[PDB]
Automatic annotation (TrEMBL), chains A, B:
Residues 28-205 form the AB hydrolase-1 domain. Pfam families: Abhydrolase_1 (PF00561). Keywords: Hydrolase. PANTHER family: EPOXIDE HYDROLASE (PTHR43329). This is Probable epoxide hydrolase. SUPFAM superfamilies: alpha/beta-Hydrolases (SSF53474). One of its GO terms (molecular function) is hydrolase activity.
Length: 295, 295
Protein backbone atom coordinates (compact mmCIF):
# COMPACT_ATOMS: atom_id res chain seq x y z
CA UNK A 1 0.00 0.00 0.00
CA UNK A 2 1.47 3.35 -1.10
CA UNK A 3 2.33 6.29 1.14
CA UNK A 4 0.13 9.25 0.50
CA UNK A 5 -1.55 8.16 -2.64
CA UNK A 6 -2.66 11.08 -4.74
CA UNK A 7 -1.03 13.81 -2.69
CA UNK A 8 0.53 16.63 -4.67
CA UNK A 9 3.89 17.87 -3.35
CA UNK A 10 4.40 21.66 -3.36
CA UNK A 11 7.09 24.12 -2.28
CA UNK A 12 5.63 27.41 -1.06
CA UNK A 13 7.69 30.62 -0.93
CA UNK A 14 6.60 32.73 1.99
CA UNK A 15 8.05 35.86 3.50
CA UNK A 16 10.56 34.05 5.74
CA UNK A 17 10.57 30.42 4.57
CA UNK A 18 10.53 27.82 1.79
CA UNK A 19 7.90 25.33 2.96
CA UNK A 20 7.19 21.76 1.89
CA UNK A 21 3.46 21.09 1.66
CA UNK A 22 1.55 17.98 0.37
CA UNK A 23 -2.14 18.42 -0.58
CA UNK A 24 -5.16 16.28 -1.48
CA UNK A 25 -8.92 16.48 -1.51
CA UNK A 26 -11.73 18.98 -1.62
CA UNK A 27 -14.15 20.38 0.93
CA UNK A 28 -13.47 22.11 4.23
CA UNK A 29 -9.74 22.66 4.89
CA UNK A 30 -7.70 20.77 7.46
CA UNK A 31 -4.03 21.57 8.19
CA UNK A 32 -2.10 18.68 9.77
CA UNK A 33 1.14 19.51 11.63
CA UNK A 34 3.65 16.77 12.59
CA UNK A 35 6.14 16.83 15.44
CA UNK A 36 9.67 15.88 16.48
CA UNK A 37 11.80 14.23 15.09
CA UNK A 38 9.51 13.73 12.14
CA UNK A 39 8.01 15.16 8.96
CA UNK A 40 4.61 15.34 7.29
CA UNK A 41 4.87 11.63 6.45
CA UNK A 42 3.92 10.90 10.05
CA UNK A 43 0.32 11.46 8.82
CA UNK A 44 0.42 8.74 6.23
CA UNK A 45 -2.11 6.45 8.04
CA UNK A 46 -4.58 9.27 8.68
CA UNK A 47 -4.36 11.84 5.86
CA UNK A 48 -5.66 9.68 2.98
CA UNK A 49 -8.92 8.87 4.85
CA UNK A 50 -9.43 12.54 5.71
CA UNK A 51 -8.83 13.54 2.10
CA UNK A 52 -11.94 11.53 1.12
CA UNK A 53 -14.07 14.23 2.71
CA UNK A 54 -11.90 17.31 3.33
CA UNK A 55 -9.22 19.45 1.77
CA UNK A 56 -6.09 18.13 3.46
CA UNK A 57 -2.87 20.11 3.77
CA UNK A 58 0.25 18.42 5.26
CA UNK A 59 3.22 20.68 6.01
CA UNK A 60 6.80 20.22 7.17
CA UNK A 61 7.35 22.67 10.06
CA UNK A 62 9.95 25.36 9.43
CA UNK A 63 13.41 23.72 9.69
CA UNK A 64 12.04 20.19 9.79
CA UNK A 65 11.97 17.80 6.84
CA UNK A 66 12.22 19.79 3.61
CA UNK A 67 11.08 23.13 5.03
CA UNK A 68 13.67 25.78 5.68
CA UNK A 69 14.01 29.28 6.93
CA UNK A 70 15.45 31.70 4.32
CA UNK A 71 18.00 32.59 7.10
CA UNK A 72 19.55 33.64 12.71
CA UNK A 73 16.00 32.66 11.83
CA UNK A 74 13.05 32.74 14.26
CA UNK A 75 11.92 29.18 15.16
CA UNK A 76 9.38 30.21 17.83
CA UNK A 77 5.86 28.77 17.68
CA UNK A 78 4.55 32.29 16.84
CA UNK A 79 6.83 32.36 13.71
CA UNK A 80 5.78 28.89 12.65
CA UNK A 81 2.14 29.90 13.26
CA UNK A 82 2.61 32.81 10.80
CA UNK A 83 4.01 30.26 8.28
CA UNK A 84 0.70 28.35 8.56
CA UNK A 85 -1.45 31.44 7.97
CA UNK A 86 0.62 32.28 4.91
CA UNK A 87 0.64 28.68 3.65
CA UNK A 88 -3.13 28.27 3.96
CA UNK A 89 -3.78 31.74 2.57
CA UNK A 90 -1.68 30.96 -0.52
CA UNK A 91 -3.65 27.74 -1.01
CA UNK A 92 -6.91 29.71 -0.87
CA UNK A 93 -8.02 29.38 2.78
CA UNK A 94 -8.49 32.24 5.27
CA UNK A 95 -10.06 29.90 7.87
CA UNK A 96 -9.31 26.24 8.52
CA UNK A 97 -9.17 23.48 11.11
CA UNK A 98 -5.80 22.49 12.62
CA UNK A 99 -4.79 18.99 13.76
CA UNK A 100 -1.40 18.88 15.46
CA UNK A 101 0.80 16.18 17.02
CA UNK A 102 3.73 16.87 19.36
CA UNK A 103 5.51 20.09 18.23
CA UNK A 104 2.81 20.58 15.58
CA UNK A 105 0.15 20.86 18.24
CA UNK A 106 2.28 23.59 19.88
CA UNK A 107 2.34 25.54 16.62
CA UNK A 108 -1.37 24.92 16.33
CA UNK A 109 -2.53 26.24 19.69
CA UNK A 110 -0.33 29.31 19.32
CA UNK A 111 -1.87 29.94 15.91
CA UNK A 112 -5.40 29.55 17.40
CA UNK A 113 -4.65 31.94 20.31
CA UNK A 114 -3.11 34.65 18.10
CA UNK A 115 -5.53 34.28 15.20
CA UNK A 116 -8.90 33.21 16.47
CA UNK A 117 -10.76 34.16 13.26
CA UNK A 118 -8.49 31.83 11.22
CA UNK A 119 -8.80 28.64 13.25
CA UNK A 120 -12.19 26.88 12.84
CA UNK A 121 -11.39 23.97 15.16
CA UNK A 122 -8.29 22.56 16.86
CA UNK A 123 -7.21 19.02 17.70
CA UNK A 124 -4.21 18.29 19.93
CA UNK A 125 -2.73 14.77 19.75
CA UNK A 126 -1.16 14.17 23.17
CA UNK A 127 -0.02 17.71 23.88
CA UNK A 128 -0.78 20.35 26.46
CA UNK A 129 0.54 23.91 26.46
CA UNK A 130 4.20 24.41 27.32
CA UNK A 131 3.25 26.59 30.28
CA UNK A 132 1.54 23.56 31.86
CA UNK A 133 4.52 21.26 30.98
CA UNK A 134 7.03 23.52 32.68
CA UNK A 135 4.95 23.73 35.85
CA UNK A 136 4.98 19.90 36.02
CA UNK A 137 8.78 19.49 35.96
CA UNK A 138 10.15 17.18 38.64
CA UNK A 139 12.86 14.45 38.77
CA UNK A 140 10.79 11.88 36.82
CA UNK A 141 9.73 14.37 34.14
CA UNK A 142 13.31 15.54 33.56
CA UNK A 143 14.60 11.93 33.28
CA UNK A 144 11.78 10.92 30.86
CA UNK A 145 12.09 14.09 28.79
CA UNK A 146 15.85 14.64 29.19
CA UNK A 147 16.03 15.93 25.66
CA UNK A 148 13.84 18.90 26.44
CA UNK A 149 16.72 20.08 28.61
CA UNK A 150 19.59 18.92 26.41
CA UNK A 151 18.28 20.41 23.12
CA UNK A 152 17.56 23.76 24.88
CA UNK A 153 21.19 24.25 26.01
CA UNK A 154 22.98 27.20 24.37
CA UNK A 155 24.17 27.00 20.79
CA UNK A 156 26.05 24.80 19.78
CA UNK A 157 26.22 22.27 22.58
CA UNK A 158 23.35 19.98 21.64
CA UNK A 159 24.09 20.36 17.92
CA UNK A 160 27.53 18.95 18.63
CA UNK A 161 26.25 16.02 20.61
CA UNK A 162 23.33 14.94 18.39
CA UNK A 163 25.29 15.64 15.19
CA UNK A 164 28.07 13.14 15.85
CA UNK A 165 26.11 10.03 14.79
CA UNK A 166 22.83 11.50 13.70
CA UNK A 167 21.05 8.46 12.33
CA UNK A 168 21.81 6.49 15.50
CA UNK A 169 20.37 9.21 17.75
CA UNK A 170 17.32 9.61 15.42
CA UNK A 171 16.57 5.88 15.43
CA UNK A 172 17.08 5.59 19.21
CA UNK A 173 14.75 8.53 19.78
CA UNK A 174 12.06 7.08 17.55
CA UNK A 175 12.23 3.67 19.26
CA UNK A 176 12.04 5.32 22.68
CA UNK A 177 9.04 7.52 21.69
CA UNK A 178 7.26 4.44 20.28
CA UNK A 179 7.90 2.49 23.51
CA UNK A 180 9.60 -0.13 21.33
CA UNK A 181 6.55 -0.79 19.10
CA UNK A 182 7.05 -1.44 15.38
CA UNK A 183 5.10 1.58 14.09
CA UNK A 184 7.47 3.18 11.60
CA UNK A 185 6.93 2.40 7.95
CA UNK A 186 10.44 1.74 6.60
CA UNK A 187 10.05 4.32 3.87
CA UNK A 188 8.69 7.05 6.23
CA UNK A 189 11.70 6.17 8.42
CA UNK A 190 14.20 6.90 5.55
CA UNK A 191 12.57 10.34 5.18
CA UNK A 192 12.92 11.01 8.94
CA UNK A 193 16.52 9.81 8.82
CA UNK A 194 17.45 11.95 5.80
CA UNK A 195 16.09 15.08 7.50
CA UNK A 196 17.97 14.34 10.74
CA UNK A 197 21.23 13.80 8.76
CA UNK A 198 20.92 17.50 7.62
CA UNK A 199 22.75 19.72 10.17
CA UNK A 200 20.33 22.58 9.41
CA UNK A 201 17.38 20.39 10.50
CA UNK A 202 19.13 19.39 13.74
CA UNK A 203 19.84 23.06 14.41
CA UNK A 204 16.20 24.02 13.72
CA UNK A 205 15.05 21.32 16.18
CA UNK A 206 17.36 22.68 18.90
CA UNK A 207 16.02 26.18 18.16
CA UNK A 208 12.42 24.84 18.64
CA UNK A 209 13.39 23.44 22.08
CA UNK A 210 15.17 26.72 23.01
CA UNK A 211 12.04 28.68 22.05
CA UNK A 212 9.92 26.34 24.20
CA UNK A 213 11.94 27.34 27.29
CA UNK A 214 11.91 31.04 26.45
CA UNK A 215 9.66 33.07 24.10
CA UNK A 216 7.01 30.29 23.68
CA UNK A 217 6.48 30.05 27.44
CA UNK A 218 6.42 33.87 27.76
CA UNK A 219 3.70 33.96 25.08
CA UNK A 220 1.58 31.37 26.84
CA UNK A 221 1.98 33.26 30.17
CA UNK A 222 0.88 36.54 28.56
CA UNK A 223 -2.30 34.83 27.26
CA UNK A 224 -2.96 33.32 30.67
CA UNK A 225 -2.44 36.75 32.22
CA UNK A 226 -4.91 38.27 29.76
CA UNK A 227 -7.42 35.42 30.18
CA UNK A 228 -7.11 34.84 26.41
CA UNK A 229 -8.50 31.43 25.39
CA UNK A 230 -8.90 29.42 22.13
CA UNK A 231 -12.25 30.47 20.65
CA UNK A 232 -12.96 27.34 18.53
CA UNK A 233 -14.00 23.81 19.43
CA UNK A 234 -11.05 21.85 20.80
CA UNK A 235 -10.48 18.12 20.86
CA UNK A 236 -7.58 16.54 22.82
CA UNK A 237 -6.68 12.85 22.35
CA UNK A 238 -4.22 11.74 25.01
CA UNK A 239 -2.07 8.77 25.86
CA UNK A 240 -3.74 6.41 28.34
CA UNK A 241 -1.55 6.78 31.47
CA UNK A 242 -1.97 8.13 35.01
CA UNK A 243 -2.14 11.93 35.36
CA UNK A 244 -1.26 13.75 38.56
CA UNK A 245 -3.65 16.31 40.02
CA UNK A 246 -4.00 19.27 37.70
CA UNK A 247 -2.17 17.46 34.91
CA UNK A 248 -5.07 15.61 33.19
CA UNK A 249 -5.09 16.81 29.55
CA UNK A 250 -8.86 17.38 29.39
CA UNK A 251 -8.73 19.46 32.57
CA UNK A 252 -5.78 21.41 31.25
CA UNK A 253 -7.38 22.22 27.93
CA UNK A 254 -10.57 23.38 29.72
CA UNK A 255 -8.38 26.05 31.35
CA UNK A 256 -7.40 27.25 27.86
CA UNK A 257 -10.70 26.97 25.98
CA UNK A 258 -14.43 27.09 26.62
CA UNK A 259 -15.34 24.27 24.22
CA UNK A 260 -13.30 21.14 24.89
CA UNK A 261 -13.81 17.42 24.41
CA UNK A 262 -11.52 14.45 24.25
CA UNK A 263 -10.63 10.81 24.84
CA UNK A 264 -7.84 8.53 26.06
CA UNK A 265 -6.19 6.45 23.30
CA UNK A 266 -4.41 3.15 24.11
CA UNK A 267 -1.03 3.77 22.50
CA UNK A 268 2.25 5.53 22.84
CA UNK A 269 2.77 9.22 22.42
CA UNK A 270 3.10 8.59 18.64
CA UNK A 271 -0.66 8.64 18.02
CA UNK A 272 -0.63 9.26 14.26
CA UNK A 273 1.41 6.13 13.54
CA UNK A 274 0.60 3.95 16.56
CA UNK A 275 -3.23 4.37 16.77
CA UNK A 276 -4.44 5.69 13.42
CA UNK A 277 -7.82 4.00 13.36
CA UNK A 278 -8.69 5.11 16.92
CA UNK A 279 -7.52 8.62 16.05
CA UNK A 280 -9.56 8.64 12.83
CA UNK A 281 -12.74 7.55 14.52
CA UNK A 282 -12.42 10.44 17.00
CA UNK A 283 -11.32 13.01 14.43
CA UNK A 284 -14.04 12.16 12.02
CA UNK A 285 -16.71 12.30 14.71
CA UNK A 286 -15.41 15.62 16.01
CA UNK A 287 -15.25 17.24 12.57
CA UNK A 288 -18.76 15.96 11.74
CA UNK A 289 -20.20 17.21 15.02
CA UNK A 290 -18.71 20.69 14.46
CA UNK A 291 -19.55 21.02 10.83
CA UNK A 292 -21.17 24.45 11.57
CA UNK A 293 -17.88 25.73 13.08
CA UNK A 294 -16.13 24.80 9.84
CA UNK A 295 -18.56 26.90 7.73
CA UNK B 1 55.20 26.61 41.42
CA UNK B 2 54.90 22.81 41.24
CA UNK B 3 51.71 20.77 41.53
CA UNK B 4 51.63 18.70 44.65
CA UNK B 5 55.15 19.07 45.79
CA UNK B 6 56.29 16.14 47.86
CA UNK B 7 53.25 13.96 47.34
CA UNK B 8 53.93 10.27 46.89
CA UNK B 9 51.81 8.54 44.22
CA UNK B 10 50.49 5.08 45.11
CA UNK B 11 48.29 2.42 43.51
CA UNK B 12 46.26 0.49 46.08
CA UNK B 13 44.78 -2.95 45.32
CA UNK B 14 41.50 -3.37 47.12
CA UNK B 15 38.85 -6.03 46.92
CA UNK B 16 37.01 -4.48 43.95
CA UNK B 17 39.31 -1.75 42.62
CA UNK B 18 42.78 -0.47 41.68
CA UNK B 19 42.88 2.99 43.24
CA UNK B 20 45.18 5.95 42.60
CA UNK B 21 46.13 7.70 45.83
CA UNK B 22 48.64 10.57 46.49
CA UNK B 23 49.89 11.08 50.07
CA UNK B 24 51.87 13.63 52.10
CA UNK B 25 52.35 14.70 55.68
CA UNK B 26 52.01 13.42 59.20
CA UNK B 27 49.51 13.93 61.99
CA UNK B 28 45.76 13.39 62.02
CA UNK B 29 44.44 11.91 58.75
CA UNK B 30 42.39 13.80 56.18
CA UNK B 31 40.93 12.14 53.06
CA UNK B 32 40.16 14.58 50.23
CA UNK B 33 37.69 13.46 47.53
CA UNK B 34 37.35 15.35 44.21
CA UNK B 35 34.33 15.50 41.93
CA UNK B 36 33.19 15.53 38.31
CA UNK B 37 34.74 15.74 35.71
CA UNK B 38 37.98 15.88 37.64
CA UNK B 39 40.67 13.98 39.52
CA UNK B 40 42.64 14.35 42.74
CA UNK B 41 44.63 17.19 41.15
CA UNK B 42 41.65 19.45 41.81
CA UNK B 43 43.11 19.72 45.35
CA UNK B 44 46.42 21.12 44.25
CA UNK B 45 45.85 24.60 45.80
CA UNK B 46 44.66 23.21 49.13
CA UNK B 47 46.40 19.88 49.83
CA UNK B 48 49.99 21.16 50.23
CA UNK B 49 48.96 23.62 52.99
CA UNK B 50 47.01 20.91 54.80
CA UNK B 51 49.96 18.53 54.57
CA UNK B 52 51.98 20.96 56.73
CA UNK B 53 49.89 19.90 59.71
CA UNK B 54 47.98 16.72 58.81
CA UNK B 55 48.35 13.40 57.06
CA UNK B 56 46.77 14.12 53.68
CA UNK B 57 45.37 11.42 51.40
CA UNK B 58 44.11 12.39 47.90
CA UNK B 59 42.25 9.71 45.96
CA UNK B 60 40.82 9.34 42.46
CA UNK B 61 37.23 8.06 42.86
CA UNK B 62 36.56 4.62 41.41
CA UNK B 63 36.37 4.99 37.60
CA UNK B 64 37.66 8.56 37.60
CA UNK B 65 41.21 9.59 36.77
CA UNK B 66 43.52 6.61 37.22
CA UNK B 67 41.24 4.60 39.50
CA UNK B 68 39.39 1.66 38.05
CA UNK B 69 37.00 -1.05 39.02
CA UNK B 70 38.44 -4.58 38.52
CA UNK B 71 35.19 -5.20 36.49
CA UNK B 72 29.39 -4.60 35.49
CA UNK B 73 31.04 -2.88 38.43
CA UNK B 74 29.16 -1.09 41.24
CA UNK B 75 29.66 2.71 41.01
CA UNK B 76 27.19 3.63 43.78
CA UNK B 77 28.30 6.00 46.54
CA UNK B 78 28.09 3.08 49.02
CA UNK B 79 30.66 1.12 46.89
CA UNK B 80 32.96 4.11 46.60
CA UNK B 81 32.56 4.67 50.37
CA UNK B 82 33.81 1.09 50.96
CA UNK B 83 36.82 1.93 48.71
CA UNK B 84 37.66 4.79 51.10
CA UNK B 85 37.47 2.61 54.22
CA UNK B 86 39.76 0.08 52.56
CA UNK B 87 42.14 2.76 51.23
CA UNK B 88 42.51 4.48 54.60
CA UNK B 89 42.74 1.18 56.44
CA UNK B 90 45.58 0.03 54.17
CA UNK B 91 47.40 3.32 54.84
CA UNK B 92 47.06 2.74 58.60
CA UNK B 93 43.92 4.72 59.55
CA UNK B 94 40.71 3.29 61.05
CA UNK B 95 39.29 6.79 61.69
CA UNK B 96 39.80 9.96 59.67
CA UNK B 97 38.29 13.26 58.57
CA UNK B 98 36.74 13.54 55.09
CA UNK B 99 36.71 16.66 52.89
CA UNK B 100 34.68 16.24 49.71
CA UNK B 101 33.82 18.41 46.70
CA UNK B 102 31.00 17.68 44.23
CA UNK B 103 30.73 13.87 43.73
CA UNK B 104 33.41 13.39 46.40
CA UNK B 105 31.21 15.00 49.01
CA UNK B 106 28.47 12.50 48.02
CA UNK B 107 30.85 9.61 48.64
CA UNK B 108 31.85 11.28 51.87
CA UNK B 109 28.44 11.73 53.46
CA UNK B 110 27.45 8.20 52.52
CA UNK B 111 30.64 6.93 54.15
CA UNK B 112 29.87 8.98 57.31
CA UNK B 113 26.26 7.71 57.51
CA UNK B 114 27.19 4.04 57.03
CA UNK B 115 30.36 4.11 59.13
CA UNK B 116 30.01 6.63 61.89
CA UNK B 117 32.94 5.27 63.94
CA UNK B 118 35.30 5.79 60.96
CA UNK B 119 34.51 9.41 60.11
CA UNK B 120 35.96 11.92 62.63
CA UNK B 121 34.66 15.03 60.86
CA UNK B 122 33.11 15.84 57.47
CA UNK B 123 33.36 18.86 55.19
CA UNK B 124 31.10 19.31 52.16
CA UNK B 125 32.24 21.81 49.50
CA UNK B 126 29.04 23.04 47.86
CA UNK B 127 27.03 19.84 48.08
CA UNK B 128 23.85 18.73 49.77
CA UNK B 129 22.48 15.19 49.83
CA UNK B 130 21.00 13.84 46.61
CA UNK B 131 17.65 13.34 48.31
CA UNK B 132 17.42 17.11 48.83
CA UNK B 133 18.59 17.80 45.21
CA UNK B 134 15.90 15.61 43.70
CA UNK B 135 13.17 17.27 45.75
CA UNK B 136 14.29 20.66 44.34
CA UNK B 137 13.95 19.72 40.64
CA UNK B 138 12.03 22.24 38.56
CA UNK B 139 12.44 23.77 35.05
CA UNK B 140 15.41 25.98 36.03
CA UNK B 141 17.22 23.20 37.89
CA UNK B 142 16.88 20.78 34.97
CA UNK B 143 18.16 23.39 32.46
CA UNK B 144 21.14 24.33 34.70
CA UNK B 145 21.97 20.72 35.53
CA UNK B 146 20.89 19.13 32.23
CA UNK B 147 23.73 16.67 32.49
CA UNK B 148 22.31 15.10 35.62
CA UNK B 149 19.49 13.89 33.38
CA UNK B 150 21.52 13.15 30.26
CA UNK B 151 24.28 11.10 32.00
CA UNK B 152 21.63 9.06 33.90
CA UNK B 153 19.91 7.84 30.70
CA UNK B 154 20.19 4.08 30.08
CA UNK B 155 23.43 2.55 28.86
CA UNK B 156 24.85 3.48 26.30
CA UNK B 157 23.06 6.64 25.25
CA UNK B 158 25.10 9.25 27.10
CA UNK B 159 28.34 7.32 26.50
CA UNK B 160 27.67 7.67 22.80
CA UNK B 161 26.97 11.36 22.95
CA UNK B 162 29.82 12.47 25.26
CA UNK B 163 32.29 10.05 23.65
CA UNK B 164 32.12 11.53 20.17
CA UNK B 165 34.43 14.52 20.85
CA UNK B 166 35.41 13.93 24.43
CA UNK B 167 37.94 16.68 24.98
CA UNK B 168 35.54 19.28 23.59
CA UNK B 169 32.74 18.22 25.94
CA UNK B 170 35.20 18.04 28.91
CA UNK B 171 36.54 21.54 28.26
CA UNK B 172 33.04 22.99 27.71
CA UNK B 173 31.86 21.42 30.95
CA UNK B 174 34.80 22.77 32.91
CA UNK B 175 34.31 26.30 31.53
CA UNK B 176 30.60 26.16 32.35
CA UNK B 177 31.21 24.89 35.93
CA UNK B 178 33.80 27.66 36.46
CA UNK B 179 31.35 30.31 35.19
CA UNK B 180 34.02 31.24 32.64
CA UNK B 181 36.74 32.02 35.21
CA UNK B 182 40.36 31.08 34.48
CA UNK B 183 40.83 28.63 37.38
CA UNK B 184 42.29 25.54 35.72
CA UNK B 185 46.02 25.08 35.90
CA UNK B 186 47.01 24.00 32.38
CA UNK B 187 48.75 20.89 33.65
CA UNK B 188 45.83 19.82 35.93
CA UNK B 189 43.66 20.38 32.83
CA UNK B 190 45.74 17.88 30.73
CA UNK B 191 45.17 15.29 33.49
CA UNK B 192 41.39 15.94 33.44
CA UNK B 193 41.40 15.74 29.66
CA UNK B 194 43.37 12.48 29.53
CA UNK B 195 40.93 10.82 31.95
CA UNK B 196 37.89 12.01 29.97
CA UNK B 197 39.46 10.69 26.71
CA UNK B 198 39.33 7.15 28.33
CA UNK B 199 35.96 5.53 27.45
CA UNK B 200 36.06 3.57 30.73
CA UNK B 201 36.18 6.86 32.70
CA UNK B 202 33.25 8.31 30.74
CA UNK B 203 31.30 5.13 31.41
CA UNK B 204 32.13 5.26 35.14
CA UNK B 205 30.90 8.88 35.26
CA UNK B 206 27.58 7.91 33.63
CA UNK B 207 27.30 5.04 36.14
CA UNK B 208 27.79 7.58 39.01
CA UNK B 209 24.92 9.72 37.63
CA UNK B 210 22.71 6.61 37.18
CA UNK B 211 23.39 5.60 40.79
CA UNK B 212 22.46 9.12 41.94
CA UNK B 213 18.97 8.70 40.46
CA UNK B 214 18.52 5.19 41.81
CA UNK B 215 20.35 3.32 44.62
CA UNK B 216 22.04 6.47 46.08
CA UNK B 217 18.69 8.22 46.53
CA UNK B 218 17.12 5.02 47.96
CA UNK B 219 19.97 4.88 50.51
CA UNK B 220 19.49 8.48 51.56
CA UNK B 221 15.69 7.91 51.90
CA UNK B 222 16.26 4.84 54.10
CA UNK B 223 18.48 6.92 56.43
CA UNK B 224 15.90 9.69 56.54
CA UNK B 225 13.24 7.09 57.31
CA UNK B 226 15.37 5.70 60.14
CA UNK B 227 16.28 9.18 61.45
CA UNK B 228 19.94 8.22 60.92
CA UNK B 229 22.23 11.27 60.97
CA UNK B 230 25.99 11.98 60.57
CA UNK B 231 27.49 11.65 64.07
CA UNK B 232 30.61 13.84 63.57
CA UNK B 233 31.09 17.58 63.28
CA UNK B 234 30.06 18.80 59.83
CA UNK B 235 31.17 21.88 57.96
CA UNK B 236 29.47 23.00 54.70
CA UNK B 237 31.01 25.74 52.52
CA UNK B 238 28.55 26.85 49.85
CA UNK B 239 28.45 29.02 46.78
CA UNK B 240 27.16 32.53 47.51
CA UNK B 241 23.82 32.61 45.63
CA UNK B 242 20.12 32.86 46.55
CA UNK B 243 18.55 29.73 48.08
CA UNK B 244 14.84 29.01 47.95
CA UNK B 245 12.96 28.11 51.13
CA UNK B 246 14.18 24.81 52.50
CA UNK B 247 17.14 24.77 50.11
CA UNK B 248 19.76 26.72 52.13
CA UNK B 249 22.76 24.36 52.54
CA UNK B 250 23.24 25.07 56.26
CA UNK B 251 19.56 24.37 56.92
CA UNK B 252 19.73 21.21 54.87
CA UNK B 253 22.78 19.84 56.61
CA UNK B 254 21.16 20.54 60.02
CA UNK B 255 18.45 18.07 58.97
CA UNK B 256 21.16 15.43 58.45
CA UNK B 257 23.47 16.10 61.42
CA UNK B 258 23.36 17.48 64.94
CA UNK B 259 26.66 19.37 64.74
CA UNK B 260 26.79 21.65 61.72
CA UNK B 261 28.56 24.89 60.84
CA UNK B 262 29.38 26.65 57.63
CA UNK B 263 29.92 29.74 55.49
CA UNK B 264 29.16 31.23 52.08
CA UNK B 265 32.20 31.49 49.76
CA UNK B 266 32.29 34.06 46.91
CA UNK B 267 33.11 31.81 43.97
CA UNK B 268 31.75 29.31 41.55
CA UNK B 269 30.83 25.77 42.40
CA UNK B 270 34.53 24.84 41.82
CA UNK B 271 35.61 25.82 45.34
CA UNK B 272 38.90 23.92 45.49
CA UNK B 273 40.34 25.70 42.45
CA UNK B 274 38.36 28.96 42.45
CA UNK B 275 38.56 29.95 46.18
CA UNK B 276 41.41 27.99 47.75
CA UNK B 277 42.51 30.58 50.29
CA UNK B 278 38.94 31.18 51.54
CA UNK B 279 38.41 27.43 51.70
CA UNK B 280 41.70 26.92 53.58
CA UNK B 281 40.93 29.54 56.17
CA UNK B 282 37.61 27.82 56.94
CA UNK B 283 38.99 24.29 56.82
CA UNK B 284 41.90 25.06 59.03
CA UNK B 285 39.71 26.80 61.59
CA UNK B 286 37.21 23.95 61.59
CA UNK B 287 39.85 21.24 62.00
CA UNK B 288 41.55 23.23 64.80
CA UNK B 289 38.27 23.81 66.63
CA UNK B 290 37.42 20.08 66.49
CA UNK B 291 40.82 18.76 67.36
CA UNK B 292 39.21 16.58 70.11
CA UNK B 293 36.92 14.91 67.52
CA UNK B 294 40.01 13.97 65.53
CA UNK B 295 41.61 12.18 68.53
CL1 LIG C 1 5.57 18.06 22.26
CL1 LIG D 1 27.64 17.08 42.99
Amino acid sequence: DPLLPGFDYLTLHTSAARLRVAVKGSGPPLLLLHGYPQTHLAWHRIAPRLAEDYSVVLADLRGYGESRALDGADYSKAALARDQLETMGQLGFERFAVIGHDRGARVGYRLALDHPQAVAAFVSLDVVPILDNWAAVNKVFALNAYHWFLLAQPYDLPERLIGADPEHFLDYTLRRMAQGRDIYHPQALESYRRAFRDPAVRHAMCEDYRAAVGVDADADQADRDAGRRLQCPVQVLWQERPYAAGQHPLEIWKTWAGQVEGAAIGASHMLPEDAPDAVLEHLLGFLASHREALR
